[PDB]
């Protein structure tokens, strides 16, 4: 399965999705800079509308514990 095919379900907790992401990211062998680009970009983009909304409110500069606690009720 390709990294672009990794997406969050409509009922799937973000948490279970983030695990899937760094597992697939774990099978990507690209430069770190590209993998940083993938992190800030693709993760949020394939996140579900309800959490996506939430993550837009965190702004930039956000870290994984704060994202992970931010989308917990969703």
């Amino acid at each position: 399965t390709s990294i672009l095919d990794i997406r969050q379900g409509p009922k799937e907790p973000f948490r279970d999705y983030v695990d899937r992401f760094y597992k697939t990211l774990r099978a990507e062998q690209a430069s770190q800079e590209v993998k940083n680009w993938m992190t800030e970009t693709l993760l949020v983009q394939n996140a579900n509308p309800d959490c996506k909304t939430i993550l837009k409110a965190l702004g930039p500069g956000a870290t994984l514990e704060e994202m992970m606690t931010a989308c917990q009720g969703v």
Partner: protein
Amino acid sequence: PIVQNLQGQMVHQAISPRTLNAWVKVVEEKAFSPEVIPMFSALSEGATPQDLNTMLNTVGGHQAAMQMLKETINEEAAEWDRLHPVHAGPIAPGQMREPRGSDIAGTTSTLQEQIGWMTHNPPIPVGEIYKRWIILGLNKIVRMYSP
């Protein structure tokens, strides 16, 4: 790990498979539970950075946590480099080089280099510095993964 031989010197010996498997099994069974930290600490007795990356890299599952830890290890390493600047002028022929955050993380150093630092007189405890980062990052995880 680096262990003391019968002759009375410190030499490297490899870690055992049923030790490896015991590390695996702990993680399988008790996941993020606090007992994992003393357990880790015992099984990390006399361990190298290299052996500590081996233990972290051999995990399966809990990849969100494994990434959070990595990123904590690099933060703690970035902080090592910040706090301890490089030293004045060229490295002496008679001496061996001071470590960086990445040598502590095992990344930029070789095994023989890791044995030089630990076995030499004074010895430097690069295991124990990484160990605190691991334990600190273990607290981060434990606190998050509390429900």
